[PDB]
Coordinates of C-alpha atoms and ligand atoms in Angstrom, one line a residue:
Chain I
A1 CA -22.2 10.8 22.5
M2 CA -18.9 9.6 21.2
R3 CA -17.0 10.7 18.1
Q4 CA -16.3 7.9 15.7
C5 CA -13.1 8.6 13.7
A6 CA -11.3 6.5 11.1
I7 CA -7.7 6.9 10.0
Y8 CA -7.0 5.9 6.4
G9 CA -4.0 6.1 4.1
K10 CA -1.6 4.1 2.1
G11 CA 0.5 1.3 3.7
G12 CA 3.6 2.4 5.6
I13 CA 2.5 6.1 5.6
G14 CA 2.2 6.3 9.4
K15 CA -1.4 5.4 10.3
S16 CA -0.7 3.3 13.3
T17 CA 2.1 5.4 14.7
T18 CA 0.1 8.6 14.3
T19 CA -3.1 7.0 15.6
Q20 CA -1.6 5.5 18.7
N21 CA 0.3 8.7 19.6
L22 CA -2.8 10.9 18.9
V23 CA -4.8 8.6 21.2
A24 CA -2.2 8.6 23.9
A25 CA -2.3 12.4 23.9
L26 CA -6.1 12.3 24.1
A27 CA -5.9 9.9 27.1
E28 CA -3.3 12.2 28.7
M29 CA -5.9 15.0 28.4
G30 CA -8.5 12.9 30.2
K31 CA -10.4 11.5 27.2
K32 CA -11.7 7.8 27.2
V33 CA -10.7 6.2 23.9
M34 CA -11.0 2.9 22.1
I35 CA -8.7 1.8 19.1
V36 CA -10.1 -0.7 16.7
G37 CA -7.4 -2.1 14.4
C38 CA -8.7 -2.7 10.8
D39 CA -5.4 -3.5 9.0
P40 CA -4.4 -7.2 8.5
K41 CA -0.9 -6.3 9.8
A42 CA -2.6 -6.3 13.2
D43 CA 0.0 -4.1 15.1
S44 CA -2.2 -1.1 15.5
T45 CA -2.4 -1.4 19.3
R46 CA 1.1 -2.6 20.2
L47 CA 2.4 0.8 21.4
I48 CA -0.6 1.2 23.8
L49 CA -0.3 -2.3 25.1
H50 CA 3.6 -2.4 25.3
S51 CA 3.3 -5.6 23.3
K52 CA 4.5 -7.5 20.2
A53 CA 1.0 -7.1 18.7
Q54 CA -2.4 -8.2 19.9
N55 CA -4.3 -11.5 19.2
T56 CA -7.1 -10.8 16.8
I57 CA -10.9 -11.4 17.0
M58 CA -10.6 -13.7 14.0
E59 CA -7.9 -15.8 15.7
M60 CA -9.7 -15.8 19.1
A61 CA -13.0 -16.8 17.5
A62 CA -11.3 -19.7 15.8
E63 CA -9.7 -21.0 19.0
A64 CA -12.9 -20.6 21.0
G65 CA -15.2 -22.1 18.3
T66 CA -17.4 -19.2 17.3
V67 CA -17.4 -15.5 17.8
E68 CA -20.3 -16.0 20.2
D69 CA -18.1 -17.9 22.5
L70 CA -16.0 -14.8 23.0
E71 CA -16.7 -12.3 25.7
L72 CA -15.9 -8.6 25.2
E73 CA -13.6 -8.7 28.3
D74 CA -11.6 -11.4 26.6
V75 CA -11.0 -9.4 23.5
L76 CA -10.6 -5.8 24.6
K77 CA -7.4 -5.0 26.4
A78 CA -6.5 -1.8 28.2
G79 CA -3.0 -0.1 28.0
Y80 CA -1.5 3.3 28.5
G81 CA -3.9 5.8 29.9
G82 CA -6.7 3.2 30.0
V83 CA -7.0 3.2 26.2
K84 CA -9.0 0.1 25.1
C85 CA -7.6 -1.9 22.2
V86 CA -8.9 -4.5 19.8
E87 CA -7.6 -6.0 16.6
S88 CA -9.8 -7.3 13.8
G89 CA -7.4 -9.7 12.0
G90 CA -8.0 -11.1 8.6
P91 CA -7.5 -14.3 6.6
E92 CA -4.0 -15.5 5.5
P93 CA -2.7 -14.1 2.2
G94 CA -4.2 -15.8 -0.8
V95 CA -7.2 -17.0 1.1
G96 CA -10.5 -15.1 1.1
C97 CA -11.0 -11.4 1.3
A98 CA -8.4 -9.5 3.2
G99 CA -11.0 -7.2 4.8
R100 CA -13.4 -9.9 6.0
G101 CA -12.2 -9.7 9.6
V102 CA -13.2 -6.0 9.9
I103 CA -16.9 -6.8 9.3
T104 CA -16.8 -9.6 12.0
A105 CA -15.0 -7.3 14.5
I106 CA -17.1 -4.2 14.2
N107 CA -20.3 -6.3 14.4
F108 CA -19.0 -8.1 17.5
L109 CA -18.1 -4.9 19.2
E110 CA -21.5 -3.3 18.5
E111 CA -23.5 -6.4 19.7
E112 CA -21.4 -6.9 22.8
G113 CA -21.9 -3.3 24.0
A114 CA -18.3 -2.0 23.5
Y115 CA -19.8 1.4 22.5
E116 CA -20.6 2.2 26.1
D117 CA -21.6 5.7 27.0
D118 CA -18.6 7.3 28.7
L119 CA -16.3 6.6 25.7
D120 CA -15.3 10.0 24.1
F121 CA -13.6 8.7 20.9
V122 CA -13.3 5.6 18.9
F123 CA -10.5 5.4 16.3
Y124 CA -10.5 2.8 13.5
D125 CA -7.0 2.2 11.9
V126 CA -7.9 1.1 8.4
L127 CA -5.9 -0.1 5.5
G128 CA -6.4 2.3 2.5
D129 CA -4.6 0.9 -0.5
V130 CA -7.9 -0.6 -1.7
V131 CA -11.3 0.7 -0.7
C132 CA -13.4 -2.5 -0.9
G133 CA -14.8 -5.3 1.2
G134 CA -14.3 -4.8 5.0
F135 CA -12.0 -1.9 4.4
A136 CA -14.9 0.0 2.8
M137 CA -17.3 -1.1 5.5
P138 CA -16.6 1.8 7.9
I139 CA -17.6 4.2 5.2
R140 CA -20.3 2.1 3.5
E141 CA -22.0 1.2 6.8
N142 CA -21.7 4.6 8.5
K143 CA -19.4 3.4 11.3
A144 CA -16.8 6.3 11.2
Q145 CA -18.3 9.7 10.7
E146 CA -15.0 11.5 10.6
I147 CA -12.3 10.3 8.2
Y148 CA -8.7 11.6 8.6
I149 CA -6.2 10.7 5.9
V150 CA -2.5 10.4 6.7
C151 CA -0.4 11.3 3.7
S152 CA 2.8 12.9 2.6
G153 CA 4.2 14.7 -0.5
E154 CA 4.7 11.2 -2.0
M155 CA 2.7 10.9 -5.2
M156 CA 1.3 7.5 -4.1
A157 CA 0.2 8.9 -0.7
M158 CA -1.7 11.7 -2.4
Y159 CA -3.3 9.3 -4.9
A160 CA -4.4 7.2 -2.0
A161 CA -6.0 10.3 -0.3
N162 CA -7.9 11.0 -3.5
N163 CA -9.0 7.4 -3.8
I164 CA -10.4 7.3 -0.3
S165 CA -12.1 10.6 -0.9
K166 CA -13.9 9.1 -4.0
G167 CA -15.2 6.4 -1.7
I168 CA -16.6 9.0 0.7
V169 CA -18.4 10.7 -2.1
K170 CA -19.9 7.4 -3.3
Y171 CA -21.7 6.9 0.0
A172 CA -22.7 10.5 0.6
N173 CA -26.4 9.9 0.0
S174 CA -26.7 7.6 3.1
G175 CA -25.3 7.9 6.6
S176 CA -23.0 10.8 7.6
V177 CA -19.5 9.8 6.7
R178 CA -17.4 12.9 5.9
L179 CA -13.7 13.8 5.4
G180 CA -12.3 15.6 8.4
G181 CA -8.9 16.5 7.2
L182 CA -5.5 15.5 6.0
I183 CA -2.5 14.8 8.3
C184 CA 0.9 15.3 6.7
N185 CA 3.4 12.8 8.0
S186 CA 6.6 14.5 6.8
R187 CA 9.2 13.0 4.6
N188 CA 11.5 15.9 5.6
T189 CA 11.1 17.6 2.2
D190 CA 11.0 21.3 1.4
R191 CA 7.6 23.0 1.0
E192 CA 5.9 19.7 1.9
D193 CA 3.5 21.5 4.3
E194 CA 2.4 23.9 1.6
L195 CA 1.9 20.9 -0.8
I196 CA -0.5 19.1 1.5
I197 CA -2.3 22.4 2.4
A198 CA -2.9 22.9 -1.4
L199 CA -4.1 19.3 -1.8
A200 CA -6.5 19.7 1.1
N201 CA -7.9 23.0 -0.3
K202 CA -8.5 21.3 -3.7
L203 CA -10.4 18.5 -1.9
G204 CA -12.4 21.0 0.1
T205 CA -10.9 20.0 3.5
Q206 CA -7.9 21.2 5.5
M207 CA -4.4 20.0 6.7
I208 CA -5.2 19.4 10.3
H209 CA -1.5 19.0 11.3
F210 CA 2.0 18.6 9.9
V211 CA 3.8 15.8 11.8
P212 CA 7.6 16.1 11.5
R213 CA 9.9 13.2 10.8
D214 CA 11.6 12.5 14.1
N215 CA 13.9 9.6 15.1
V216 CA 12.4 9.7 18.6
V217 CA 9.5 7.7 17.1
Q218 CA 11.8 4.8 16.3
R219 CA 13.4 4.9 19.8
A220 CA 10.0 4.8 21.4
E221 CA 8.7 2.0 19.2
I222 CA 11.7 -0.2 19.7
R223 CA 10.6 0.0 23.4
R224 CA 6.9 -0.7 22.4
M225 CA 5.7 2.8 23.5
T226 CA 4.2 5.9 22.1
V227 CA 6.4 9.0 22.2
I228 CA 3.8 10.4 24.6
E229 CA 4.7 7.7 27.1
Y230 CA 8.4 7.2 26.2
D231 CA 9.5 10.8 26.5
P232 CA 6.7 13.2 27.5
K233 CA 9.1 16.2 27.1
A234 CA 10.1 15.4 23.5
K235 CA 9.4 18.0 20.9
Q236 CA 7.6 15.3 19.0
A237 CA 5.3 14.6 22.0
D238 CA 4.1 18.3 21.8
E239 CA 3.5 17.7 18.0
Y240 CA 1.1 14.9 18.8
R241 CA -0.5 17.0 21.5
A242 CA -1.1 19.7 19.0
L243 CA -2.7 17.2 16.5
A244 CA -4.9 15.9 19.3
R245 CA -6.1 19.4 20.3
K246 CA -7.0 20.2 16.7
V247 CA -8.9 16.9 16.2
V248 CA -10.9 17.6 19.3
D249 CA -11.6 21.2 18.1
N250 CA -12.3 20.4 14.5
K251 CA -15.7 21.3 13.1
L252 CA -15.1 21.0 9.4
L253 CA -16.5 17.7 8.0
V254 CA -17.1 17.8 4.3
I255 CA -18.1 15.7 1.3
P256 CA -14.8 16.0 -0.6
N257 CA -14.2 17.1 -4.2
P258 CA -11.8 14.4 -5.7
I259 CA -9.3 15.8 -8.2
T260 CA -8.1 14.5 -11.6
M261 CA -4.7 13.0 -12.2
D262 CA -3.7 16.2 -14.1
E263 CA -4.4 18.3 -11.0
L264 CA -2.4 16.0 -8.8
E265 CA 0.6 16.1 -11.2
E266 CA 0.3 19.9 -11.5
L267 CA 0.5 20.1 -7.7
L268 CA 3.7 18.1 -7.6
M269 CA 5.3 20.0 -10.5
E270 CA 4.5 23.4 -8.9
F271 CA 5.8 22.7 -5.4
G272 CA 9.0 21.3 -7.0
Chain H
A1 CA 7.6 -20.9 -24.9
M2 CA 7.3 -17.6 -23.1
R3 CA 8.2 -16.7 -19.5
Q4 CA 5.3 -15.4 -17.5
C5 CA 6.6 -13.1 -14.7
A6 CA 4.7 -11.1 -12.2
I7 CA 6.0 -8.1 -10.3
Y8 CA 4.5 -7.6 -6.8
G9 CA 5.2 -5.3 -3.9
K10 CA 3.7 -2.6 -1.7
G11 CA 2.1 0.5 -3.2
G12 CA 4.6 3.2 -4.2
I13 CA 7.7 1.0 -3.9
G14 CA 8.5 1.2 -7.7
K15 CA 6.8 -1.7 -9.4
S16 CA 5.7 0.2 -12.5
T17 CA 8.9 2.2 -12.9
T18 CA 11.0 -0.9 -12.5
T19 CA 8.8 -3.1 -14.7
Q20 CA 8.7 -0.6 -17.6
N21 CA 12.4 0.1 -17.5
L22 CA 13.2 -3.6 -17.2
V23 CA 10.9 -4.4 -20.2
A24 CA 12.4 -1.5 -22.3
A25 CA 15.9 -3.0 -21.7
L26 CA 14.6 -6.4 -22.8
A27 CA 13.1 -4.9 -25.9
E28 CA 16.4 -3.1 -26.6
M29 CA 18.0 -6.6 -26.4
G30 CA 15.7 -8.0 -29.0
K31 CA 13.0 -9.7 -26.8
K32 CA 9.3 -9.5 -27.6
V33 CA 7.4 -8.5 -24.4
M34 CA 3.8 -7.8 -23.3
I35 CA 3.0 -5.8 -20.1
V36 CA -0.3 -6.5 -18.4
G37 CA -1.3 -3.8 -15.8
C38 CA -3.0 -5.4 -12.8
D39 CA -3.1 -2.4 -10.4
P40 CA -6.2 -0.1 -10.2
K41 CA -3.9 3.0 -10.6
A42 CA -3.7 1.9 -14.3
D43 CA -0.5 3.8 -15.1
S44 CA 1.7 0.7 -15.6
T45 CA 2.2 1.2 -19.3
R46 CA 2.4 5.0 -19.7
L47 CA 6.2 5.1 -20.0
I48 CA 6.1 2.6 -22.9
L49 CA 3.2 4.4 -24.6
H50 CA 4.4 8.0 -23.9
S51 CA 1.0 8.6 -22.6
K52 CA -1.0 9.9 -19.6
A53 CA -2.1 6.3 -18.9
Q54 CA -4.0 3.7 -20.9
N55 CA -7.8 3.1 -21.2
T56 CA -8.6 -0.1 -19.4
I57 CA -10.3 -3.3 -20.4
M58 CA -13.0 -2.6 -17.9
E59 CA -13.6 0.9 -19.3
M60 CA -13.6 -0.3 -22.9
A61 CA -15.9 -3.2 -22.3
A62 CA -18.4 -0.9 -20.6
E63 CA -18.4 1.6 -23.6
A64 CA -18.6 -1.2 -26.1
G65 CA -21.3 -3.2 -24.3
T66 CA -19.6 -6.4 -23.4
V67 CA -16.0 -7.7 -23.3
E68 CA -17.0 -9.9 -26.3
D69 CA -17.5 -6.7 -28.4
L70 CA -13.8 -5.9 -27.9
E71 CA -11.1 -7.0 -30.3
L72 CA -7.6 -7.7 -29.1
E73 CA -6.3 -5.1 -31.6
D74 CA -8.5 -2.5 -29.9
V75 CA -7.2 -3.2 -26.5
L76 CA -3.5 -4.0 -26.9
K77 CA -1.3 -1.0 -27.8
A78 CA 2.4 -1.1 -28.9
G79 CA 5.0 1.5 -27.7
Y80 CA 8.7 1.7 -27.3
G81 CA 10.6 -1.2 -28.8
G82 CA 7.3 -2.8 -29.9
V83 CA 6.4 -3.6 -26.3
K84 CA 2.7 -4.5 -26.2
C85 CA 0.6 -3.0 -23.4
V86 CA -2.8 -3.5 -21.7
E87 CA -4.4 -2.3 -18.5
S88 CA -7.0 -4.3 -16.6
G89 CA -8.7 -1.5 -14.7
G90 CA -11.0 -2.0 -11.7
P91 CA -14.1 -0.7 -10.1
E92 CA -14.3 2.7 -8.6
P93 CA -13.4 3.0 -4.9
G94 CA -16.1 1.8 -2.5
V95 CA -17.8 -0.3 -5.2
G96 CA -17.1 -4.0 -5.6
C97 CA -13.8 -5.8 -5.3
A98 CA -10.8 -3.7 -6.4
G99 CA -9.2 -6.7 -8.1
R100 CA -12.2 -7.8 -10.2
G101 CA -10.8 -6.3 -13.4
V102 CA -7.7 -8.5 -13.3
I103 CA -9.8 -11.6 -13.7
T104 CA -11.7 -10.2 -16.6
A105 CA -8.5 -8.9 -18.3
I106 CA -6.4 -12.1 -18.1
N107 CA -9.3 -14.3 -19.3
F108 CA -9.9 -11.9 -22.2
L109 CA -6.2 -12.0 -23.2
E110 CA -6.1 -15.8 -23.1
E111 CA -9.3 -16.3 -25.1
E112 CA -8.4 -13.7 -27.7
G113 CA -5.0 -15.3 -28.4
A114 CA -2.8 -12.6 -27.0
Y115 CA -0.3 -15.3 -25.8
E116 CA 0.9 -15.8 -29.3
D117 CA 4.1 -17.9 -29.9
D118 CA 6.8 -15.4 -30.6
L119 CA 6.4 -13.5 -27.3
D120 CA 9.4 -14.1 -25.1
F121 CA 8.1 -12.6 -21.8
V122 CA 4.8 -11.4 -20.3
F123 CA 5.0 -9.2 -17.2
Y124 CA 2.1 -8.6 -14.9
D125 CA 2.3 -5.5 -12.7
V126 CA 0.2 -6.4 -9.6
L127 CA -0.9 -4.5 -6.6
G128 CA 0.5 -6.4 -3.5
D129 CA -0.8 -4.6 -0.4
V130 CA -3.5 -7.3 -0.1
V131 CA -3.3 -10.8 -1.6
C132 CA -6.9 -11.6 -2.5
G133 CA -9.5 -11.4 -5.2
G134 CA -8.0 -10.7 -8.6
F135 CA -4.7 -9.7 -7.1
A136 CA -4.2 -13.3 -6.0
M137 CA -5.5 -14.7 -9.2
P138 CA -2.0 -14.7 -11.0
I139 CA -0.8 -16.9 -8.2
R140 CA -3.9 -19.0 -7.5
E141 CA -4.7 -19.7 -11.2
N142 CA -1.0 -20.3 -12.2
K143 CA -0.8 -17.3 -14.6
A144 CA 2.7 -16.1 -13.5
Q145 CA 5.2 -18.8 -12.8
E146 CA 8.0 -16.4 -11.8
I147 CA 7.2 -13.8 -9.0
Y148 CA 9.7 -11.0 -8.5
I149 CA 9.1 -8.7 -5.5
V150 CA 10.2 -5.1 -5.5
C151 CA 11.0 -4.0 -1.9
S152 CA 13.4 -1.7 0.1
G153 CA 14.8 -1.5 3.6
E154 CA 11.4 0.0 4.6
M155 CA 9.8 -2.3 7.2
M156 CA 6.4 -2.2 5.4
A157 CA 8.1 -3.1 2.1
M158 CA 9.7 -6.2 3.7
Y159 CA 6.4 -7.1 5.4
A160 CA 4.7 -7.0 2.0
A161 CA 7.4 -9.3 0.5
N162 CA 6.8 -11.8 3.4
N163 CA 3.0 -11.6 2.9
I164 CA 3.3 -12.2 -0.9
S165 CA 5.6 -15.2 -0.1
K166 CA 2.9 -16.7 2.2
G167 CA 0.5 -16.5 -0.8
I168 CA 3.0 -18.4 -3.0
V169 CA 3.4 -21.1 -0.3
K170 CA -0.4 -21.5 0.0
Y171 CA -0.8 -22.5 -3.7
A172 CA 2.4 -24.6 -3.9
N173 CA 0.4 -27.9 -4.2
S174 CA -1.1 -26.8 -7.6
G175 CA 0.4 -25.2 -10.6
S176 CA 4.0 -23.9 -10.7
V177 CA 4.1 -20.4 -9.2
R178 CA 7.4 -19.7 -7.6
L179 CA 9.4 -16.9 -6.1
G180 CA 12.1 -15.8 -8.5
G181 CA 13.8 -13.1 -6.4
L182 CA 13.7 -9.8 -4.6
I183 CA 14.6 -6.5 -6.3
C184 CA 15.8 -3.8 -4.0
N185 CA 14.7 -0.3 -5.1
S186 CA 17.0 1.8 -3.0
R187 CA 16.0 4.5 -0.4
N188 CA 19.6 5.7 -0.5
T189 CA 20.3 4.2 3.0
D190 CA 23.5 2.6 4.3
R191 CA 23.8 -1.3 4.1
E192 CA 20.4 -1.5 2.4
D193 CA 21.8 -4.0 -0.2
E194 CA 23.1 -6.2 2.6
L195 CA 19.7 -6.0 4.4
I196 CA 17.7 -7.2 1.3
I197 CA 20.3 -9.9 0.6
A198 CA 19.8 -11.2 4.1
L199 CA 16.0 -11.1 3.8
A200 CA 16.2 -13.0 0.5
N201 CA 18.5 -15.7 2.0
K202 CA 16.0 -16.1 4.9
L203 CA 13.1 -16.6 2.4
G204 CA 15.2 -19.0 0.3
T205 CA 15.6 -16.8 -2.7
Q206 CA 18.1 -14.1 -3.9
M207 CA 18.4 -10.4 -4.4
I208 CA 18.4 -10.3 -8.1
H209 CA 19.5 -6.6 -8.4
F210 CA 19.9 -3.4 -6.3
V211 CA 18.4 -0.5 -8.2
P212 CA 19.8 2.8 -7.0
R213 CA 17.7 5.9 -6.3
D214 CA 18.4 8.3 -9.2
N215 CA 16.7 11.5 -10.1
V216 CA 17.0 10.7 -13.8
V217 CA 14.0 8.5 -13.3
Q218 CA 11.8 11.6 -12.4
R219 CA 13.2 13.5 -15.4
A220 CA 12.4 10.7 -17.7
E221 CA 8.9 10.2 -16.3
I222 CA 8.0 13.8 -16.5
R223 CA 8.5 13.3 -20.2
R224 CA 6.5 10.0 -20.2
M225 CA 9.5 7.8 -21.0
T226 CA 11.6 5.0 -19.5
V227 CA 15.2 6.0 -18.7
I228 CA 16.2 3.4 -21.4
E229 CA 14.5 5.6 -24.0
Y230 CA 15.1 9.0 -22.4
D231 CA 18.8 8.8 -21.8
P232 CA 20.4 5.5 -23.1
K233 CA 23.8 6.6 -21.7
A234 CA 22.6 7.2 -18.1
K235 CA 24.2 5.2 -15.4
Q236 CA 20.6 4.3 -14.3
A237 CA 20.0 2.9 -17.8
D238 CA 22.9 0.4 -17.3
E239 CA 21.4 -0.5 -14.0
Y240 CA 18.1 -1.6 -15.6
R241 CA 20.1 -3.4 -18.3
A242 CA 21.9 -5.4 -15.6
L243 CA 18.5 -6.2 -13.9
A244 CA 17.2 -7.4 -17.3
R245 CA 20.2 -9.6 -18.0
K246 CA 19.9 -11.2 -14.5
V247 CA 16.2 -11.9 -15.0
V248 CA 16.9 -13.5 -18.3
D249 CA 19.6 -15.7 -16.8
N250 CA 17.8 -16.5 -13.6
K251 CA 17.3 -20.2 -12.9
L252 CA 16.4 -20.1 -9.2
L253 CA 12.6 -20.4 -8.6
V254 CA 11.7 -21.6 -5.2
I255 CA 8.8 -22.2 -2.8
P256 CA 9.7 -19.5 -0.3
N257 CA 10.1 -19.8 3.5
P258 CA 8.2 -17.0 5.1
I259 CA 9.7 -15.5 8.3
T260 CA 8.2 -14.4 11.6
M261 CA 7.8 -10.8 12.7
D262 CA 10.6 -11.4 15.2
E263 CA 13.0 -12.4 12.4
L264 CA 12.0 -9.4 10.4
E265 CA 12.6 -7.0 13.4
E266 CA 15.9 -8.7 14.1
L267 CA 17.0 -8.0 10.5
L268 CA 16.2 -4.3 10.9
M269 CA 17.9 -4.0 14.3
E270 CA 21.1 -5.7 13.1
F271 CA 21.6 -3.7 9.9
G272 CA 21.0 -0.5 11.9
Ligands
LIG1 N1 6.7 11.1 12.2 C1 7.5 10.0 12.1 N2 8.8 10.1 12.3 C2 9.6 9.1 12.2 N3 9.2 7.8 11.9 C3 7.9 7.6 11.7 C4 6.9 8.7 11.8 N4 5.7 8.2 11.5 C5 5.9 6.9 11.2 N5 7.2 6.5 11.4 C6 7.7 5.2 11.1 O1 7.2 4.8 9.9 C7 6.9 3.3 9.9 C8 5.5 3.0 9.4 O2 4.6 3.7 10.3 P1 3.2 2.9 10.6 O3 2.4 3.8 11.5 O4 3.4 1.5 11.0 O5 2.5 2.9 9.1 P2 1.1 2.3 8.6 O6 0.3 1.9 9.9 O7 0.5 3.4 7.9 O8 1.5 1.1 7.8 C9 7.1 2.9 11.3 O9 8.4 2.3 11.5 C10 7.1 4.2 12.1 O10 8.0 4.1 13.3
LIG2 N1 15.1 3.9 -8.6 C1 14.3 5.1 -8.5 N2 14.9 6.3 -8.4 C2 14.1 7.4 -8.3 N3 12.8 7.4 -8.3 C3 12.1 6.2 -8.4 C4 12.9 5.0 -8.5 N4 11.9 4.0 -8.6 C5 10.7 4.6 -8.5 N5 10.8 5.9 -8.4 C6 9.7 6.9 -8.3 O1 8.9 6.4 -7.2 C7 7.5 6.7 -7.5 C8 6.7 5.4 -7.4 O2 7.1 4.4 -8.4 P1 6.0 3.4 -9.1 O3 6.8 2.6 -10.0 O4 4.9 4.3 -9.6 O5 5.5 2.6 -7.8 P2 4.3 1.5 -7.7 O6 4.0 1.1 -9.2 O7 5.0 0.4 -7.0 O8 3.2 2.1 -7.0 C9 7.5 7.2 -9.0 O9 7.4 8.6 -8.9 C10 8.8 6.9 -9.5 O10 9.3 7.9 -10.4
LIG3 S1 -9.6 -6.8 -3.4 FE1 -9.4 -8.2 -1.6 S2 -11.0 -9.8 -2.0 FE2 -11.5 -7.9 -3.3
LIG4 S1 -10.1 -6.8 0.2 FE1 -11.0 -5.9 -1.7 S2 -13.1 -6.9 -1.9 FE2 -11.8 -8.2 -0.5
LIG5 MG1 -0.5 0.2 10.7
LIG6 MG1 2.3 1.1 -10.4

């Protein structure tokens, strides 16, 4: 068995930083993990690979002719801790559906046997500002059973969490996609942990971890590394280790209860 | 003649707040303006209408039967300063293309004669995290000749500005869509104005205004108003009046020069 997890959230909220650090901590623990980038920015694996980014399946298929001319060993790359990494890519802005590459990538990985038995986890890093096309496919097509949403006390980030939850509810009659929890990626604001706990309770889930805002993240990323690799003694490294432990141990996977805009505004008013 | 302007940028960056305050200042000046919401959040007109939000063309067409059973007077609503307001709407998350409502709305407004002669400005408030489907239509179909991008020193916000610029370049052979400028919506960080000026110069455009971070915005929005209406003496009100003056006077409309990720990272490193 392997656990298939997807990380969703609004742009810039910390999906790729949180996912790569979480995965590095899992690898440090002895888990075998694959990361599948499903965001057109295509930098979801750079901290594992010590790289600028990673060439995408869409790009490589075009240079090779067809996706069938690609071999899995050409596309998957291993980095820190043996973590395996792949990027979907997507069409250029203004041309075709921004999520089309996700569909091509996941189908390629399935057919080519990337989901081999001794993997323990797969993480999809998915754009969540819209829930449609290839960005909805992990939910619609039952690819990621456990959704974790990165958010913050920012109104827009909480709105995005509610919108992703509505997409999970829409496909609850088929497959087994469920909400696993919220991850608060702090803006360094007072009572922010309590605010995201309250939001999670209203949705029917939990805040799995509160990730502090810490400048060591930027110092690690300037050097193309996770904090786990860059400074294993950092306080922030222990934060990602705690998040990883709680993801491993999590057993609460729910069909969420989306809230109204009045409820969301009341949350923000109350917690000041 | 009327000037057709579209405001793009990443989610949560300040498109709707900046657009509604800019438009209120234009109305205070004596201009006749229409706002067309092109973001599924559908709260792009609430500060003009003193409202929770606005019912969308997609919603109203469904309750009425077809979009042809709607009359323009049923859909357009006037608020502060006589500003006319309409919301496109969009499908629920996980269902169909998130931008589909934009196409329906703009076509409805054109056919029903909303673009009547004594309008001076139309502003489209457009989601910019992806540039595809209905969100690309204002560019692809030559609906907004002047694009203004709201951004900040946030890496993701600058990436979004570069991605929108790539979409403008893609359709430069047809129509007349051009980049009009960047609007910096401050995160209260040092040298941020200089950073966005430098980005604008690299793209070939200009920073049209630096909007400060000011808590009066939240106090006005809790009361469902623009700062222009809520406190006409506020320093922030004069900021939006300066932005409005510069938009009116702007004559620089360019085909932008998108930059590479290395250039974008070098900008951030340099300005610290
Ligand atoms: N806990 C944190 N502390 C400090 N900086 C962070 C933290 N999480 C993310 N960042 C920074 O925020 C920016 C955006 O994070 P990223 O993971 O790229 O967002 P997304 O993938 O959701 O667009 C990056 O520059 C990253 O270094
Ligand atoms: N200059 C500013 N100062 C203070 N708060 C702001 C400013 N601009 C925007 N905001 C706040 O930022 C949040 C997001 O702005 P909004 O216009 O809704 O973003 P978008 O439409 O781009 O998603 C809102 O709560 C708004 O009140
Ligand atoms: S939103 Fe992108 S193509 Fe439908
Ligand atoms: S991205 Fe939304 S439907 Fe294509
Ligand atoms: Mg990312
Ligand atoms: Mg908005």
